Design a protein around this ligand. Structure first.
Ligand SMILES: *[C@@H]1O[C@H](CO)[C@@H](O[C@@H]2O[C@H](CO)[C@@H](O[C@@H]3O[C@H](CO[C@H]4O[C@H](CO[C@H]5O[C@H](CO)[C@@H](O)[C@H](O)[C@@H]5O)[C@@H](O)[C@H](O)[C@@H]4O)[C@@H](O)[C@H](O[C@H]4O[C@H](CO)[C@@H](O)[C@H](O)[C@@H]4O[C@H]4O[C@H](CO)[C@@H](O)[C@H](O)[C@@H]4O[C@H]4O[C@H](CO)[C@@H](O)[C@H](O)[C@@H]4O)[C@@H]3O)[C@H](O)[C@H]2NC(C)=O)[C@H](O)[C@H]1NC(C)=O
Lengths: 102, 154, 51
């Protein structure tokens, strides 16, 4: 039931929950093989925020969250430590296995 | 229905682990930068106490997200902490060196204390750094070239 | 990389014609040595050829 909630980067077209998150083109992977050569305008996102191991050799992070975005239940107050609270909130995350499976 | 958040009382304290000396406390406003830089180490701990109220009849309004994040300018690392609202309607934060060694992973450097606050019902997503706090504790790249060292001929 | 258990010689391959080719000398130690060409990059596939 969680969402990538961000209160500084929500688009105007929102339901009042700030669930829609406008991700900038700065925090991207910066590898032209994956995310293309051209320059991109800020993208739109509405999904569940995942996290990946820092000392993981295989995993990639195509698109991380912003600097203030946190992922927690939009209805319930924050009691525990929220999962992937900062810029380690992952939005798009890829894997390149040992058999080269994308 | 939306609301306008406001911060009323903020106290930047440098508490000394020793009982004998009284703590030194300095106050600052919402859109302001604290003069000077505070220090927190084994001998001295950091303390911040703040209260949040609404513009009209602000009876102890509690935002959904209130994270205190310290950004290290030199290395880029940042650490985010939660805020605890004691039953006196005072949000409090206590920065210790021995107690919170694991969070910062025992790394000494200068941090900036940004405060993130704002929720689904607040009008303005506040973000102002209180002061610079100095904290001090006690694969996909080519590898290095190797050349072979031959036996010296007699 | 020219490895036996650990690399003895590491050099940069240089392009000529359509192939990356390098010429060098074999170290003094005798044994069974193998060439590992491992190309790993961010986004590209993993290349690995050992003879
Ligand atoms: C019988 O069987 C035995 C079992 O196999 C054989 O024993 C083996 O023998 C080989 C070679 O004789 C040993 O390898 C060497 O160990 C040296 C000391 O070990 C260090 O090990 C740790 C460092 O290694 C770690 O490195 C990274 C770090 O994370 C890690 O990934 C890696 O896996 C490993 O854990 C360290 O912790 C220890 O404390 C020790 O310091 C080590 O110095 C040797 O490295 C040499 O050689 C290799 C390849 O030969 C090079 O890649 C290195 O860069 C380094 O190269 C130096 O020498 C080359 C030629 O000798 C030069 O071309 C290089 O430029 C470089 O020269 C510099 O250093 C010289 C001083 O030595 C200077 O004079 C130069 O000017 C340069 O400054 C190598 O790793 C095995 O450890 C050993 N295994 C066991 C189990 O004992 C035995 O040989 C068999 N018997 C016979 C007769 O063959």
């Amino acid at each position: 039931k969680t969402a990538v909630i961000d209160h500084h980067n929500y688009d105007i077209s929102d339901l009042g929950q700030h669930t829609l998150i406008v991700a900038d083109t700065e925090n991207l992977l910066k590898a032209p093989t994956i995310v293309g050569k051209s320059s991109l305008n800020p993208i739109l996102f509405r999904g569940v925020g995942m996290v990946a191991d820092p000392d993981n050799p295989l995993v990639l992070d195509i698109l991380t969250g912003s600097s203030t975005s946190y992922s927690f239940f939009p209805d319930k107050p924050i009691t525990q430590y929220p999962h992937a609270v900062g810029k380690n909130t992952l939005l798009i995350a890829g894997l390149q296995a040992r058999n080269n499976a994308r | 229905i939306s609301t306008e958040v406001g911060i009323t009382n903020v106290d930047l304290s440098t508490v000394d682990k020793d009982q004998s000396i009284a703590p030194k406390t300095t106050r600052v406003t919402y859109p302001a930068k604290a003069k000077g830089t505070f220090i927190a180490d084994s001998h001295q701990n950091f303390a911040l106490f703040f209260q949040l109220v609404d513009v009209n009849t602000g009876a102890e309004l509690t935002p959904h997200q209130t994270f205190v994040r310290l950004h290290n300018q030199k290395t880029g690392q940042e650490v985010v902490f939660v805020a605890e609202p004691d039953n006196k309607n005072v949000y409090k934060f206590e920065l210790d060196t021995s107690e919170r060694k694991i969070e910062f992973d025992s790394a000494s450097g200068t941090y900036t204390l940004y405060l993130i606050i704002g929720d689904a019902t607040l009008k303005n997503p506040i973000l102002w750094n209180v002061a610079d706090v100095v904290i001090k504790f006690p694969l996909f790249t080519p590898k290095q070239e190797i050349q072979h060292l031959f036996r010296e001929p007699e | 990389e020219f490895v036996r258990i650990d690399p003895f010689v590491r050099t940069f391959l240089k392009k000529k014609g359509g192939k990356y080719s390098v010429q060098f000398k074999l170290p003094d130690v005798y044994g069974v040595f193998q060439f590992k060409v491992d190309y790993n990059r961010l986004g590209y596939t993993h290349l690995y050829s050992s003879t």
